[PDB]
Design an enzyme around this catalytic site. Structure first.
Site: not given
Lengths: 123, 123
Positions: A15, A39, A96, A99
């Site tokens: 990914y 997100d 930074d 996920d």
């Protein structure tokens, strides 16, 4: 199948590889057709491949790298630390991020949550 | 109050400091009285300070360190990467972990989830 802990590490590493080169179509296909993305976490989610592709096109000169190993559980879940380097309006910056992803019985990302805010920005 | 993104980074950094020195009573008090913990994520949760203290006593010669910055959102949530070094039966080992925590309106950890499995073990 529901990815094993080992498969989850491989899928999430791939990914970041895709995000780094910027292959939007390949990233989009890693998601379930009706996946939802949050997100940054705290913002309303986006749902489905159409909205996710739009989201990634809008966002992706960018490089990303895993800054630590992928943490994976046995229930199709994984979490990973990484950095994103960009140039925000001529000015270069890094973000930074962590996920957290949940995969489905087909090895596709059902849900993704990204933890970060301005405190993780170094512009 | 609901910690700000900046407060969350400070609280979680402190948290690892406590785990590193091994001050069980101080760690326990960082949790809400009825907090739940899922460590490792995928396992049934433990609820309440009594069970959490028992859990930490059982687990905590151990050192822990943040291996990257704390990722914090604006809704009382945070995620952080860290390493735990121990000696499992004479044999020393390290475990890479990512903790995701949600704080309450009092600055206490309401819920904690730890992502890791044997793939993050280096024994």
């Amino acid at each position: 199948n529901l990815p094993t802990a080992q498969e989850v590490q491989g899928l999430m590493a791939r990914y970041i590889e895709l995000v780094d080169v910027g292959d939007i179509e390949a990233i989009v296909q890693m998601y379930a057709d009706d996946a939802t993305v949050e997100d940054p976490f705290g913002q309303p989610p986006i749902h489905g491949r159409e909205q996710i592709a739009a989201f990634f096109r809008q966002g992706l000169k960018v490089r990303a790298c895993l800054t630590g190993p992928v943490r994976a559980s046995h229930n199709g879940c994984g979490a990973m630390p990484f950095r994103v380097e960009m140039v925000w309006n001529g000015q270069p910056c890094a973000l930074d991020v962590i996920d957290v992803m949940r995969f489905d019985e087909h090895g596709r990302i059902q849900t993704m949550q990204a933890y970060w805010s301005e405190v993780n920005l170094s512009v």
